Structure formats: C-alpha cells, structure tokens
Symmetry: C2
Subunit: 349 residues, 2 copies
C-alpha cells in the first residue's frame, strides 16, 4: 500500500482519486481551485458510481497547496490538460525528491520530455517521469465530490524517462494499476496522439457551425466521408514521422474498420457527443499546441514532410489569431533542439 | 446597328441575347447544347421579364454550330463559366477573322491572356480580346427561352489585349453597352476577382454542411465574423499582388463597410442565397482554377507571399482529390512563363 498524489481534480482526477482510495492506497489530492477543494471537503467523500467503478471514497487529504500534496507522495499522478503540464512542473520542482515516480495522464505529444526539461531547469533532483497516450477512464463528474465512471480501459501504453526505469516504475504501481503496459520509449506514446488527428481538423472543417453554436454530433455529423478521408491523410503524416524513428505506432483505424469514417460512424460510444459550441475549444487549444505543433516540429527534424499537418496548423492559427507555432510545444520546449533524428532517439533512452 | 455572336445560353447568355435583340442588333446565339437550342427554337423567342429588362426578343439565329454563329459576327460575347474559356477559344480559332472584337463575360483571372495564347497557338489571326471582371446582369432563366432580370450594372470595368485598342473596342460597343468602362489593362480586371476570395474559402469552412447538403444561407450563415476576418486576410494577399504591378484594384469591401462581415450581412440581395448542396460546386471548380491558382502563380512571379491563398488552395485540392495547381490557370497557360514582373506588365500592353 503507498502514497499517491493526484494532481488535478477534474473528471479524470476524480476518477483516479476514487479508484485509488477504494483500492486501499493513501491519496493526497490537489486542485488549483480552492473553492472546488472546499466543496469536496464539505461533502467529505468522493462518490463514484456507474458500471466502471462504484464506491464512496475517502482521500486522506484534499488541498490546494501543491507542495503538501507532493512532498510526501511515492507516486505522483498528474491529470490535467497537457497545456498545463509546464506550469505544474515548475510549481512542484522544489518539492520533489529523488526516488519519486511522476506519471502524466496523459502526456499528449512530448509531455514527459517537456516535463523533464522544466524540472532540470529548475534544479530539481532526477526522477522517473512517465506518460500514457490514453485516458484510463471514461467518466464525468457532475459536481465536485462526484464522478460517473462508464468504464476503465483494460490496457494502457506506458513509457518513461529514463526508459530503462520502465520496469521499476511498473513494479511500483503494478498492484494497483495493472492496466499500464510498457512500450519502448516516450516517442512511442507521444507519437500515438490520436487526438492531434481527430480534434483539430474536423473542428476546422466545422468552424462556422462551432462558432455559431449550431448543434451537431461531433463524430456522427462532423465527420463525413471526405472529412474522414482527409483525416486519414493527416494520420499518414503522423505515421511517417513514427516510422522515421523506427516505431510502429497504430493508425487511427487500428487505434479503434477500413476507414476513419467507418470506425467513427460505428462506435455507439460517440452517440450523443456534441461538437464545440464556440471556437475557444480544447480541440484547438490543447490539440494543436500539444499535438500538431510538436508533430510538425518533429517531422522537420527527421526530415519527413508534413504539408497537411502544416496546412491545418496554419489555418487554425489564423482562424483564431493564435500563434501556435510559437506557443505550442517546440523542439526547444522538449529539450530536443539541434538533435539529429538519432540524437533524439538517444535522448529518450 | 451590328452583328453580335452570343456564346453560351445559360442565365447570362439569355440576358445578353435578349438585351441585344431588344436593342435592335442582329444576334446570333449559340450553345453547346442542341437540345436547349431546340427548345428555344420551338418557343420562337426569348422572354425577358423583371425590373432590369422586359421584352420579347428575337435573335436572328440560334444554333449549336459554333462557326455559323461566329464567322459573320462583328462582336463576339462569350458568356460561359471561365473554366470553359480554353475550349471555346480552340473551337472558334478557325472562324475568326482579323477585325473582330471578342469579350469574355467575365474573364475570371487571366481569361483574355489564356484566350490569346490558345488562339495564337492555333494560328488564328490577331484580334482584340477583352474581359470584364463583373457580370452585367443579375438574372435567372427558369427555362430555355426565358430569363428573369433583376438588374443591370450601371458601370463595368473593361480591359483588352492589346490595351491600346481599348478605345476602339469601346467605340464599337459603346452605343449598345455604355456600361463598360476601360481600365488600364487586363491585369486590373483579372486581379479584381472577388470571387476567388468569397467562394472557395467560406465553402471550405462549411465543407461538411455543403457535402451533407445541410441547408444554410451562404452569406448570412456561412460567413461569421472570424470567417469574414480570415477572408479579409486572403483579400489582402490579392491586393499585395495588385500593388506589386502598380495597380490599385478595390478590396472586397470597396467592391461592395469596414469589414467583409458587415458588407455581407448588410446586403438584402444575399437574402435567400443557399450554400452549395454538395462539393461538386463551381465555388471550388471554377473559383479555385481560374482564381486562386493564377493568383498564387502570379504572386510567385512578382515574389509576393501568398501563404493563405496557398493554404486554402492546398486544403481544397486534397479535400476533393483534384490537383488544381496542375489543372488550373498556370503562368504557362496564360503565356507568362519566364517573364519578370516587368515582362508581365509588358505582355499586357
């Protein structure tokens, strides 16, 4: 039985914190929002319900003080939108200690790398930092202190920095989180960012609908055959980038069907998912910064063309007046600036 | 009083043919469609109605034989979609004679140039070829032999090859078509292609709606503020191309308002215009081939960047699997290959 720090008490945060507490571990949870922490404190528990997980959980601690949640943890689970990773790394830098395990859920593209870079810049001790490319849970918290859990993934790719510590890492969480399965390195998990394909493009191709708040089923109506075919050509660029590092990451289709259109039209799970109701959506903010941007940067490195990814990237930036190539995850933010394709491979081992 | 050949008996073709015939000129009209020519023949007239033009017109001739319509004409008006210009030039090459005036209504970007190139390649006599950037009439033909004319533009830019013949040209049609006003040269008319801005982009940004046949008012609902702002940034590229040749062509706004959104939301004329109901639309086929393509090619020549035009161009090509950069109007098709910005200016004088 160990101490887990759960950072971020959003939908996922709620689920991990309940899951862990119901499994007999000590859970210390944090969220930047004091108010939210205050409502959960009043309630005195986190109620989990649904097919995937049901129970009344009791974290050992709820706080809005990051150091208090982290300082004494054995494992630190970070469950926030990838756009926040940097901020969290800088903030916890002073509390971490040699021997802790940090896991980004998930890392989007380059979460562990970016995380490692910031910690070293802030003179932190060397620690093992892992990342998963998927979300363990499908859930929704209607209010603080509550979470509905539809399901829990049965297998999850997991990789860390440094890669040799993958076994030890998994040896640590194995009893409680046997879903994690080690892949070669963090390039594998980071290049398996399906959201970078499925979110920005279809949203761009439904821009007016989204801006105008005109309701539509994101998957069912937002992705017609030609939109699915275009997404497949963007996916092919991702795959070509993975092959240039010698990795065999799965295509969007494999991630779910001979086509994306078939895959999407056929998952009943997508029944009822609405598209964005405005352009200030994560499908752009997060998936472009932590997905398209790094993908493009990477392809530039290994000299693999990404004309479609770039075209999408450039149109979205202008469409919303955000210089994503500057604000997103650049090779520099990942600590990969001036490395050759082989140098990059060597940096993750 | 003279002989006019009206080529193309679509909406515009119907209107010109009626207008001219009601004005006492001899009209010989053609259309590639025998059937259509046959229905109009049966009816024995063209009925024009509406505020802009009303009357029962009698062309002197209706035929599906191009040479018969052209051989004896003094002025030849071509009223077809710009994508057809090439074909028509090649087909009439053998019937034209020194002294005739050809006018493309309109020329889209580079209509007169492309037209001139094909005629010379086919060993035709030298003739004056003009183009207008606008459509004289706003009309609709519900059936062959009929046309509803809302209105007739009061002023139209007109330019020709060779530019010095602009006065003579206008001296020729002046009595019947006083709406035409000479501008400097064909670069002016060709760079004043507002459709290249207003059609491809908004359609792309409503791709799913269009493909799915989901009804919407093209202007009113397809162009939201951010879509209008993006169009303005594409327009700026067009304008930068015009400035590099020393021309002052009007912005989309001037062509109609401080913004495109304001302009469009405010014209009652756009009340009731639906967006495309599929992707096999002229807003792509015509406006990309005869608008975006040549604009991009031109900017490349005068060394003016057109990242947004290119981005739109590349996304549409892939979106519909059509290599527009190959099939559209290239510098080569315009007979401008290997000319310096100044050489291009010299070719139109």
């Amino acid at each position: 039985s160990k101490t887990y720090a759960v950072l971020g008490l959003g939908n996922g945060g709620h689920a991990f914190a309940a899951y862990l507490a119901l499994k007999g571990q000590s859970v210390l949870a944090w969220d930047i929002d004091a108010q939210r922490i205050k409502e959960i404190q009043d309630r005195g528990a986190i109620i989990a319900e649904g097919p995937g997980l049901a129970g009344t959980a009791h974290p050992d601690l709820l706080t809005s003080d990051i150091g208090l949640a982290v300082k004494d943890a054995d494992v630190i689970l970070i469950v926030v939108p990838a756009i926040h990773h940097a901020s969290i790394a800088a903030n916890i830098a002073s509390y971490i200690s040699e021997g802790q395990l940090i896991i980004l859920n998930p890392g989007a593209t380059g979460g562990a790398l970016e995380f490692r870079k910031i910690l070293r810049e802030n003179g932190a001790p060397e620690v093992t930092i892992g990342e998963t490319s998927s979300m363990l849970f499908t859930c929704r918290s209607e209010r603080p202190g509550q979470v509905t859990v539809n399901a829990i993934k049965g297998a999850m790719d997991f990789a860390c920095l440094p890669a040799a510590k993958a076994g030890w890492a998994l040896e640590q969480i194995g009893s409680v989180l046997p879903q994690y399965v080690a892949v070669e390195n963090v390039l594998h998990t980071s290049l398996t960012n399906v959201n970078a394909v499925m979110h920005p493009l279809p949203t761009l191709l439904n821009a007016a609908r989204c801006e105008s708040g005109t309701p539509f089923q994101y998957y069912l109506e937002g992705i017609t055959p030609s939109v699915g075919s275009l997404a497949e050509k963007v996916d092919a660029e991702r795959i070509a980038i993975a092959k240039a590092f010698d990795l065999n990451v799965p295509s969007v289709c494999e991630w779910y069907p001979a086509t994306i259109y078939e895959a999407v039209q056929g998952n009943p799970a997508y029944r009822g998912i609405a598209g964005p109701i405005n352009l200030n959506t994560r499908y752009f903010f997060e998936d472009v910064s932590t997905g398209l941007v790094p993908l493009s940067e990477l392809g530039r490195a290994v000299n693999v063309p990404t004309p479609l990814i770039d075209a999408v990237l450039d149109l979205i930036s202008s469409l919303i007046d955000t210089d994503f190539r500057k604000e997103g995850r650049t090779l520099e933010k990942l600590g990969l600036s001036g490395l050759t394709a082989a140098g990059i491979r060597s940096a993750v081992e």
